[PDB]
Design a protein around this ligand. Structure first.
Ligand SMILES: [Zn+2]
Ligand SMILES: [Zn+2]
Lengths: 260, 260
């Protein structure tokens, strides 16, 4: 078992999950000194992202975040290998400190962060197998800030009150996942890292988009208040808040950008 | 043993030192969301800080930082109990990414940070006894940024080559330690935290001065390249750089300021 606060918090993950204290750890702070433009970083192509509205996708509260299962038919094109989707989830703070993104830019947190996880389907049969293997995963990260209401993110948020407790599930009709991506996806940060949750495998090729998307104050508050990491029948409910990992040391290395 | 990098790095400290994975861990990001102005935070008085130039004080490279032993004759006045000095040391980054302070302000790291450690001499006989006990320590933190040459800090930096390797010691003539403090010392952040190195005891009353001091690019570079964490003539010399802990989560608004 692990958590983001208390005895089994992030500073203790390495006790049971060695990789959490190992190399290529994520997330990290993106600042000028360690950023470098790479003109060779071309735009990624998102295929099969427009999920059929006649299909249902499972939304689950797994006690650590709210996750939406994705089909392997949606994939990223543009990398050395094809990466097929497996799931997406989010990271956020709390009402008193609404700055829970994992990656930070110039030391600044964003309100929240979306992670769309994919696995190398060319080399591996499924995400479970690819998770702890070379070039096994590719994750898209979208920084989220407070602003205008976002109808696309609400296609997920409107179901939050039905996955309030650990183990609960809900069905989300397919919608265009590309609608969750920011403007100018051609512009992004790229680096080799890890899962930001145990087991922290250093098998993730990260793509953090440069521009953030906006969601309303209400949408952010809902995300920060609707979920609990405890089962519904638990006499002592625990709010699912501040479910983000602190930035990790990033030395002797560079994050490359597709923008100058 | 422990280090700031490798399998014995900060994510693994809790394996041997339980408190490093406990509550009230430092350093933290000093940002509005957790700050609160307090008028009871009156100016501190630094007494006995003008060390006799006719006396020598021990400077040591302990493999983690450069430390100067201080006499219990110097102490802080203004707190509930008297806190007597025991030692001072520094934390820094590296030439390619010169942002190695421990505490951050509004997410921003400073070039380096000075810590002047004191123990509660009213309650305890010495620093060792006080270290893991209630109200045991008080630390003054000075943020350092690159700027104009600093003659006072050079009274320490000029001795760096004498303690280039781990285990080495040197003598530093006494000088006014108050010269190392920034302007407007009356302005500071105050919070209850911990030692930022193992054993990470949550027994430190922190006073981080609001305003930073400046040292020249040359002084900062000297600090970042003059020391090694390895013994003299080691077959695989290792430079002492990035010897600072990552910021820790700090929930509630329990950081007070003596300014508005
Ligand atoms: Zn994630
Ligand atoms: Zn220190």
């Amino acid at each position: 078992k692990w958590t983001y606060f208390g005895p089994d918090g992030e500073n203790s993950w390495s006790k049971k999950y060695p990789s959490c204290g190992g190399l290529l750890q994520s997330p990290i702070d993106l600042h000028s000194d360690i950023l470098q433009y790479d003109a060779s970083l071309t735009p990624l192509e998102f295929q099969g992202y427009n999920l059929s509205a006649n299909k249902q996708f499972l939304l689950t509260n797994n006690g650590h975040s709210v996750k939406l299962n994705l089909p392997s038919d949606m994939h990223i094109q543009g990398l050395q290998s094809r990466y097929s989707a497996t799931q997406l989830h989010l990271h956020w703070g709390n009402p008193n400190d609404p700055h829970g993104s994992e990656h930070t830019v110039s030391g600044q947190h964003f309100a929240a962060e979306l992670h769309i996880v994919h696995y190398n389907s060319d080399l591996y049969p499924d995400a479970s197998t690819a998770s702890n293997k070379s070039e096994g995963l590719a994750v898209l990260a979208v920084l989220i800030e407070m602003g205008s209401f976002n109808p696309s993110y609400d296609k997920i948020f409107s179901h939050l009150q039905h996955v309030k407790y650990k183990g609960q599930e809900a069905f989300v009709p397919g919608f265009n996942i590309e609608e969750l991506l920011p403007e100018r996806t051609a512009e992004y940060y790229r680096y080799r890292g890890s899962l930001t949750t145990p087991p922290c495998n250093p098998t993730v090729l990260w793509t953090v988009f440069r521009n953030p998307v906006q969601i309303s104050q209400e949408q952010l508050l809902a995300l920060e208040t609707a979920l609990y990491c405890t089962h519904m029948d638990d006499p002592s409910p625990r709010e699912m808040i501040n479910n983000f990992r602190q930035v990790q040391k990033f030395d002797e290395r560079l994050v490359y950008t597709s923008f100058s």
